[PDB]
Amino acid sequence: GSMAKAAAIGIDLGTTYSCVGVFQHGKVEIIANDQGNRTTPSYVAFTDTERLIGDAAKNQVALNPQNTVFDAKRLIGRKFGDPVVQSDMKHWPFQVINDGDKPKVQVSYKGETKAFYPEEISSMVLTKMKEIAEAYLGYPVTNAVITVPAYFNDSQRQATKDAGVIAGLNVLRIINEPTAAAIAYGLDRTGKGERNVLIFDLGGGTFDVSILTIDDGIFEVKATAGDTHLGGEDFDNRLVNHFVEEFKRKHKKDISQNKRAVRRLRTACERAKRTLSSSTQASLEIDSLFEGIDFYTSITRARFEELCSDLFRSTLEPVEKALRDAKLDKAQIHDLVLVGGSTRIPKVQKLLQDFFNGRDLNKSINPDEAVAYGAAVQAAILIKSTRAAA
């Protein structure tokens, strides 16, 4: 007996990006994919000859927008008639169809028109995450913990389980994303006594605030609030609009109707935005942006902060609402935890810190990786099968 047990994995199945971890040697290792990325795009692309997942899918999205699927998490476990589904559909270049009041994404794939349920798309992203972990560990992986937003209902939770089952994974448990982040910091291991934790999660296109109470390791969701369409992509959008205007001023030319030029500008803006989190200024250099014209410029952190100022400030309204719902005062919150890559922005950090009167923020665990980190800690706990000693 007792053949060595394979490690279990923790998976953050994100709306835009996914992340996979494993707890081994008393620590969590976040596993990079073969392109060296510690997070993988939650994208699936279909061609006449291939099914591409992750980076390979995201990198060819520009010329194949109708057959490159993303945001399947926004559809999972929902009815076609759902108001959220009907509004979201207007922004996606891929076709969403009605099959018995259940949404399906329809594409061209290997010579035919094919339709997939959201949980089938998410199963393909989970298959990639499983492979990434198997490439590192050097053996097949069976068991996994998968996370969902705290506001997901039974239907959304069940459809996530089905996605794992289709991917060949045994789903140990479905756990809330905010709870997973708390586990990553060991906020459930402080012993006896009530502890109030606020999770501030600002991602690529969504913003969630969660208030939890932890008592003797037991978690309770006290409040959930947020902005459904607020994130990093809105900051990229303000920089795009600023530079479109700057090009018009300097060259008397409007670039906005050339999809390639706008796309190249946005990619450069997102990269400059990241630089501005560690540097006071950033340069933006694009060769032959429009009509053979090179675009060599810069932006200060102050100007970027001014451009996105209203958006950054608006992150505090869901913080006040969640506190109102949880029936708590700011002082009462013991721990503040930052999740999502956009929380690296100094101005965002400052606004939250000042709102909580100079309190330290838990941000030592990479914000992009904290949810998968916590999922990996819980997965290792779940597969334990100790028989009590005499």
Ligand SMILES: NC(=O)c1cn([C@@H]2O[C@H](CO)[C@@H](O)[C@H]2O)c2ncnc(N)c12
């Ligand atoms: N990993 C990083 O250093 C960063 C990722 N984002 C954004 O976080 C979101 C999820 O990756 C996207 O909108 C990114 O642009 C960032 N935004 C600002 N500063 C940063 N340093 C990052």
